[PDB]
Design a protein around this ligand. Structure first.
Ligand code: CL
Ligand code: CL
Ligand code: CL
Ligand code: CL
Ligand code: CL
Ligand code: CL
Ligand code: K
Ligand code: K
Ligand code: K
Ligand code: K
Lengths: 358, 379, 358, 379
């Protein structure tokens, strides 16, 4: 799945054509197309958890937008396809507009249908059997929590309850015809696990930043690789978690164990669950892994290096100001406004020119 | 909920969904790495008594069509897949997989950990198994059926799939544009080849016809005498199921042919038979070769071909008679893939030159056959 | 199917509710529901030939309009249902909006699908087999002609070629379990014909006005009834053609023979074809039969009373103005304006006040 | 394109489409006017050896469901309809008609001029026919089989569908709210009736239970003696296929019960049997009565009821013995509908008081039966 950055280019034409406009891409592996696709969406780093809706069901105009979005593809098309199915459109209808093979479309419609049942039955209808079937389709805990009206952590606890965890398969070029000594894996909901984690060494896990986008390029990946190379050389068993296909970080040669997965809380926790690393590094992959720190720590993950709290202190405009204050350092005059008329006054205080940060 | 279950001799169970006929199936279980060509695969007579597992997860993406049938029926004893897609999506499709399965009355299961199964087969070797599709499939009973299976080793399946009576084949290969041709006319084909049906694949015949060969398909058990009487430009030995070893009749017949100067070419089972006939031995492999990406070296030329494979037995290279020279070896395991008689106009290939499904890399093997024939006719 | 007249009440609420707003109704008989519905459509007298489109395929807002029409039923819903299927909405999507049983909906969908083939194959694709299939589903020659991009008479010719004519069945209250001496018939594309026309008497055909509407009411049907009662009494064999379930015209008692059929050129020609009447009266059923007169004559029907030409003379404002002129009679001053500024002038000529008639 | 063809004895052919099993069907052809109830009709044993034609064009609108089955199977030899709906649309549907037909292995044809067919049968009387559904239906052949059909006249079908061994029934009627109820406990049923199974509709049994009867289903050929031994509060003679005439065993037995004081009630075939055993005569109707809008007058009360009919044979009113008073007659044709013994507690009804499908109008016929029973116990 390609990664775009149209928001940064307000006045740009955002319809997809023959001239590339994507700034990067994510890759995913699944035992089935549905599983593969869903995993790819949740690793895209756009805030999606799968097929999150774009338009409201009770929007009178909804069909008009959906139609537009389908006929003239934008970056969001994938999501408008599912919205289309939620709105009553048919696979043939969608086909006629998009030209995307029905083989793919039927799979998306089916997922929408399952989402509709989840919404309906609620968390209460999330029985072991059904939950399993949904996981097997690539459904993220977060997506399922949205539909059921719960916290992601609730679905996760529920899986824990049913002992519903993925298994890991390995890439081997030959469809298992030959054995592999390499550890290049992906998760899935199947029977046999081929992870076979070592009990031998001290493990260090490095979290990558998924697809590249403006602000989050190859620079973060370079650091992730260096970490792996250095510690491995140092004698640690290095574990890389990433899903950017363009990078060296996803080259099997770069780490002792590579998990080609979505850099999400769900995905990472499952790996940590069986690897039981000594430490996890979250400061090298850019924003993506950084935004996971606090939840990882919360879940018991052994996060190494500068703490999530220390990170937060800096990243928190208020915690920070306090510290600078404390250190007796210089900072430009600043205020936190709520209302317009508030700003103008405060602005008076602060003095023009001004830096207005959302 | 339509249940199905697969149980192996070792007792390993695979719980899934029935996608074909209701009932039970028993046979040797095999894995095939072919990401495409499932229909061709199922209709391959070499798969008689075998339960076929496909490694590629989505099986049935392009539905099915007559043109994609390698024989009259589905010979695969059963089919095992990870996922049966919601729809078939290809211009050429005439019937979705499930329907077709049900049509041919095949027991088949979907939704199982085909990877687990593959790894098991590769690691521990081939195993017999049983599939039960029904309301409440009985594991115990499946196990008994799988344990009671006699095993393909030493089993003559050729005599089981062969043709009752002899016939004539004059039809050529399919084309995108035209599709399957119309049967040529006898006076249109320069050569006349006699083909032993050990359970022959349509493509093999079609491709011979493309090369200008008019065919006479005979029943496996046909006498060399009865044959010679036909004044063949050449004799071809088809592919087929089970152990080549127990096919006394054919080995004997071939032996006869080898006394003559008529050109002989065998493919697969026929390769095996030709080797036996020359005094070589065959063995049953660990899990065998089944797929369409198998690298085979032409030792003579030092070139590689990506081939189509489907065999559980092989010719032992170490027991090869001096009058048998090695022409091809597998790059995957080193096993014997081709041989030529040092003293006679006879040679064979373990792979499938006619593919269907598979890479076309090996089709030139046919050409060599033709040379032998033209030269035989010169003389 | 009910008959409405909302165009006559501009400021009115045109949505269907629990208070009746319809001004009349049509009825149709068919061996199938498809056949039955299409015949009724074509007999409604609103210019429909069946499921004629309401929205453009290539209209960006089409889905939005359709949706609305479905959700909040108006007089045109039935056509919008077909548009919905053309636009890519599924049967379930349509169900959800309209609550009309899927049993009916699938039927309509199939008809659309059939129309799309017709559009694709064109007139060349109209082999006997297919054409017959189409006729059996009640498709009108006019509908087929529009899809095929031909003249309605071309389809009718095509049918004559293939010898593809309808058969007549009778109404008998018992599903043919008992014989009937009454000749209450309806057309259908089947095997056995039960019309059994007389060779015996001179027949007179009377065409009805179809459903009642404002302006075309019971008054026209009363005349129709009297023509039949008079001539029948006079000894002719009286044949009535009408499909208004409310009227005395459609009472088996009123005539010798009753054809409960749409009053259209196609349907009427078929009856004529087999009855070979002595004359046809088109002057008593209102506008309906009147508009057919020319075509009927052209096609060889024995129209009696005032000629279609004669009718046209009167109805054509041009022809008329000459006749008044011809006779040296008085008529208000009139003009035929094309442009605005042309009218303003002409209007100065004519003098206010002015009676603008489209 | 899946062809199907129906040929009548006279040579009249109806070409249409196959909607059930592939194959052939031979039987007497009849028409049924029921706008609703196709499933119950199909599952009516009385339809054994009969090819069913439904006058209502759209057959299958509501699908199928187990509750709507009058017997353990489909008795209809074949099904002839005008149109098979695209979908089934009813909350009670569990399987579409076509699927259902296939599953029961019924040969069925759609898309034929059922009206023409109906008028023909009415005009010329019943006819035997054959439906052939397959790749290339052979008309000649179809004519052959139709023509060769033995005919229902003099055919004892009751022995063919009757139960092998006796059994007990204690199940009541379905309710919208409660569906088909749980079988009652013997101690719950006041009376004990013995029912001869001449191909009995489950609704007859159920409605008897509703009245407080515990049943004992007995084979057709069960001996009066064996029966008497059971100490029945009442004896019931069920409905069934074929000619009532040839069923000597039953006649004989009935005669035996008639010497006693035990109440006897027969429905349809059992009505004919009763009549025969009383010295009456049965005839084969022109086309018979099949539908559910049949007016029947209770001559005694001078009241009409709309009933469910399904019969090809009737009892001759003109040959009735004096001990046999007439209780009901058809308003359609005047034919004999009910009779009661002047001297015994025995009566019968030609129609189906149990309907299913059909108007409930004639249900009270059961009531009288109970009265007889209660009064028989009093004594
Ligand atoms: Cl731009
Ligand atoms: Cl569930
Ligand atoms: Cl499994
Ligand atoms: Cl328009
Ligand atoms: Cl066609
Ligand atoms: Cl017909
Ligand atoms: K990237
Ligand atoms: K499974
Ligand atoms: K009206
Ligand atoms: K037909």
């Amino acid at each position: 799945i390609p990664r775009f950055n149209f928001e940064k280019f307000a006045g740009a034409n955002d319809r997809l054509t023959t001239q590339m406009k994507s700034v990067g891409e994510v890759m995913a592996i699944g035992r089935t197309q549905q599983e593969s696709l869903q995993k790819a969406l949740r690793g895209l780093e756009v805030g999606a958890t799968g097929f999150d809706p774009k338009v409201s069901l009770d929007d009178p105009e909804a069909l008009t937008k959906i139609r537009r979005e389908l006929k003239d593809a934008g970056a969001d098309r994938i999501w408008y396809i599912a919205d289309a199915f939620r709105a009553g459109l048919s696979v043939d209808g969608v086909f006629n507009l998009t030209n995307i093979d029905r083989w793919f479309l039927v799979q998306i419609e089916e997922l929408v249908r399952l989402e509709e049942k989840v919404a309906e039955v609620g968390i209460t209808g999330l029985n072991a059997d059904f939950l399993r079937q949904l996981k097997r389709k690539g459904f993220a805990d977060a997506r399922l929590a949205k539909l059921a009206g719960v916290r992601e952590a609730e679905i996760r606890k529920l899986r824990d309850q049913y002992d519903l965890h993925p298994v890991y398969k390995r890439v081997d070029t030959c469809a298992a015809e030959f054995a592999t000594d390499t550890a290049y894996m992906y998760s899935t909901y199947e029977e046999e696990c081929e992870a076979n984690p070592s009990t031998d060494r001290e493990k260090i896990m490095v979290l990558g930043g998924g697809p590249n986008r403006i602000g989050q390029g190859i620079e973060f990946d370079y650091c992730c690789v260096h970490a792996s190379l250095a510690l491995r050389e140092d004698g640690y068993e290095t574990i890389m978690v990433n899903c950017n296909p363009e990078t060296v970080s996803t080259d099997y040669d770069t780490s002792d164990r590579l998990y080609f997965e979505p850099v999400t809380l769900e995905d990472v926790l499952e790996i940590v669950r069986i690897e039981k690393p000594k430490g996890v590094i979250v400061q090298y992959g850019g924003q993506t892994p950084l935004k996971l720190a606090r939840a990882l720590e919360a879940a018991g993950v052994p996060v190494i290096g500068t703490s999530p709290d220390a990170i937060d202190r800096a990243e928190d405009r208020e915690r920070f100001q306090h510290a600078v204050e404390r250190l007796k350092l210089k900072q430009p005059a600043n205020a936190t406004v709520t209302a317009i008329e508030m700003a103008v006054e405060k602005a008076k205080e602060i003095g023009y020119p001004l830096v207005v940060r959302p | 909920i339509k249940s199905a279950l697969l149980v192996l001799e070792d007792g390993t169970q695979f719980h899934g969904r029935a996608i074909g006929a209701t009932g039970s199936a028993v046979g040797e279980v095999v894995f095939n790495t072919s990401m495409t060509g499932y229909q061709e695969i199922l209709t391959d007579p070499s798969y008689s008594r075998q339960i076929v597992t496909l490694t590629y997860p989505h099986i049935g993406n392009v539905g099915t069509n007559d043109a994609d049938e390698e024989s009259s029926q589905v010979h695969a004893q059963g089919l095992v897949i990870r996922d049966l897609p919601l729809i078939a999506s290809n211009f050429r499709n005439t019937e979705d997989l499930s329907s077709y399965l049900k049509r041919h009355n095949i027991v088949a299961i979907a939704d199982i950990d085909t990877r687990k199964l593959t790894r098991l087969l590769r690691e521990k070797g081939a195993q017999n198994g049983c599939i039960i599709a029904g309301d409440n499939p009985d594991a115990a009973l499946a196990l008994e059926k799988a344990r009671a299976f006699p095993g393909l080793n030493g089993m003559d399946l050729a005599k089981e799939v062969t043709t009752a009576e002899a016939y004539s084949w004059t039809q050529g290969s399919w084309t995108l544009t035209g599709g399957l041709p119309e049967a040529k006319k006898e006076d249109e084909l320069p050569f006349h080849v006699v083909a032993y049906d050990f359970g022959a694949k349509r493509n093999i015949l079609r491709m011979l016809v493309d090369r200008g060969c008019r065919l006479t398909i005979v029943p496996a058990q046909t006498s060399a005498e009865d044959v010679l009487k036909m004044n063949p430009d050449g004799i071809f030995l088809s592919n087929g199921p089970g152990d080549p070893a127990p096919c006394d009749y054919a080995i004997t017949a071939i032996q006869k042919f080898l006394e003559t100067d008529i050109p002989v070419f065998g493919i697969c089972l026929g390769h095996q038979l030709l080797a036996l006939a020359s005094g070589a031995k065959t063995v049953k492999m660990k899990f065998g070769h089944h797929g369409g990406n198998h690298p085979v070296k032409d030792v003579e030329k030092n070139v590689v071909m990506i081939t189509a494979q489907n065999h559980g037995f092989a010719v032992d290279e170490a027991t090869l008679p001096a009058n048998l020279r090695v022409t091809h070896k597998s790059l995957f395991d080193g096993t014997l893939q081709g041989i030529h008689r040092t003293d006679k106009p006879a040679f064979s290939f373990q792979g499938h030159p006619e593919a269907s499904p598979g890479p076309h890399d090996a089709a030139p093997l046919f050409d060599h056959f033709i040379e032998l024939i033209e030269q035989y006719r010169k003389t």
